[PDB]
Amino acid sequence: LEYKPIKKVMVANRGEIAIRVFRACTELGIRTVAIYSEQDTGQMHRQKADEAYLIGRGLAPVQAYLHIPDIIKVAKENNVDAVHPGYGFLSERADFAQACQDAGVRFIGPSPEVVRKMGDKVEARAIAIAAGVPVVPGTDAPITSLHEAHEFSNTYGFPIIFKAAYGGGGRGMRVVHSYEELEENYTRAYSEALAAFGNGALFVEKFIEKPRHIEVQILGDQYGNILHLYERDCSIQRRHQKVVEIAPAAHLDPQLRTRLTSDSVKLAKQVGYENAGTVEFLVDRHGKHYFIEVNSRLQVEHTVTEEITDVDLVHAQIHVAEGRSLPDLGLRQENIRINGCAIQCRVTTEDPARSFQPDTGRIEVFRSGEGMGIRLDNASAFQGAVISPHYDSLLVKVIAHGKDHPTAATKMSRALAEFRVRG
């Protein structure tokens, strides 16, 4: 009902997503503004938009994009109507979001209240317990005595898992099978938690052998109307990170995927989200799903659904940011449907042999192998390209759309064969 159209959008990042948003804007005819740091004057994004302005003159390049006031002043001076923060850099920053609202410049994304409410794991746990799907089972409170663990192993099951809170390290990951093993593992876990770390907020959870985290994409308007995009599979993980992606479901029970769909829809309704988000679950072999968390920014593999559903996500984001409702766009359940098999790969200048560590240098020769149903997104690829040793090491993202999953597999294998990056 409220039409407040967009005249210009500002990108506060660098790289492939900047090109994505710039092409989307010029396809919508939106006046584009680009921003670069002193080291990163060699990318294509700075010369691809209409304007290029430098930021962070003396600050470190890693924090050069992390200076809010300067980019705020740049947005104001260039009469920036809307800003999109992209990902990784300042999208998790609630201060920047509230500042964006303070300047009056329209924000591409949810309201700052939702971002702030996400906050720590504690708000997520409280909301999930209050209204949502079950979270990974176990203990809400820390275990500091042998008796809590003993009772919870007696009650739920002898095999339990000890995890350590207030720490992302995997050193707090212990397995319990029997009483004599229970007390010894508890003792040594408590010792390591209090020694290597501070508060030993140990948690007892169920024994998990194979996790398989599955992703749900959600779009909404500012009018309380919510559409789940569709599901995506990420069974592939180097150790904890994405390397390749499979959107269509390998082994999913339609009852279970329907449960996940309805659960994500109702939880998006519960949170009251306003823009692009995703809910990731964690399934066991047996057929139970468990919440993990929600990403409130536009995910990288978003465009993968873009091949699944034949709908743009960045355009829909633009349109909700204008104030339109999804039914005006004709965004309802019946028209969006699974169409094809998709596989995702990303090339990084890292050596998979010794430690998966990146390489730095100058590329000598590069060639393109775009296929019939093979979509290519180029981050930083040109003759004489030099990869920065401080920013990310992403060069090319490859999308394979095949009539079958093995179809895409073999096509993108051939694409890997045709690509040549030497030196």
């Binding site: 503004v33 680009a34 004057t41 060699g42 990318q43 294509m44 700075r46 010369q47 209409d50 304007e51 290029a52 302005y53 040109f382 003759q383 004489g384 390209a385």
Partner: protein
């Protein structure tokens, strides 16, 4: 010489026709000027000297001169330049 004529341009042609013809011809065959440093205007760039040119509000051009070839085709020397993201060669 095309549509790019304004009353001040008309006046300039009226007072001094011939030099205006020379000037418009030269600018057309060489592109915009006055965006150069006077060093570049008279001396031109020196090899292995990178420099910057500003063309519009946000419009930055980083030009590095790589090398100069020799005479190959009845007096056609080639030169090599590097722009942000691209390498070019000029005959």
């Amino acid at each position: 010489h095309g549509e790019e004529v304004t009353p001040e341009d008309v006046l300039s042609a009226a007072m001094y026709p011939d030099v205006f013809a020379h000037f418009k011809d030269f600018t057309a065959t060489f592109g915009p000027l006055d965006s150069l440093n006077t060093r570049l205007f008279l001396q031109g760039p020196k090899i292995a000297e990178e420099f910057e040119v500003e063309l519009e509000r946000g419009k930055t051009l980083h030009i590095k001169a790589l090398a100069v070839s020799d005479l190959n085709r009845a007096g056609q020397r080639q030169v090599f330049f590097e722009l942000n993201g691209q390498l070019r060669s000029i005959l």
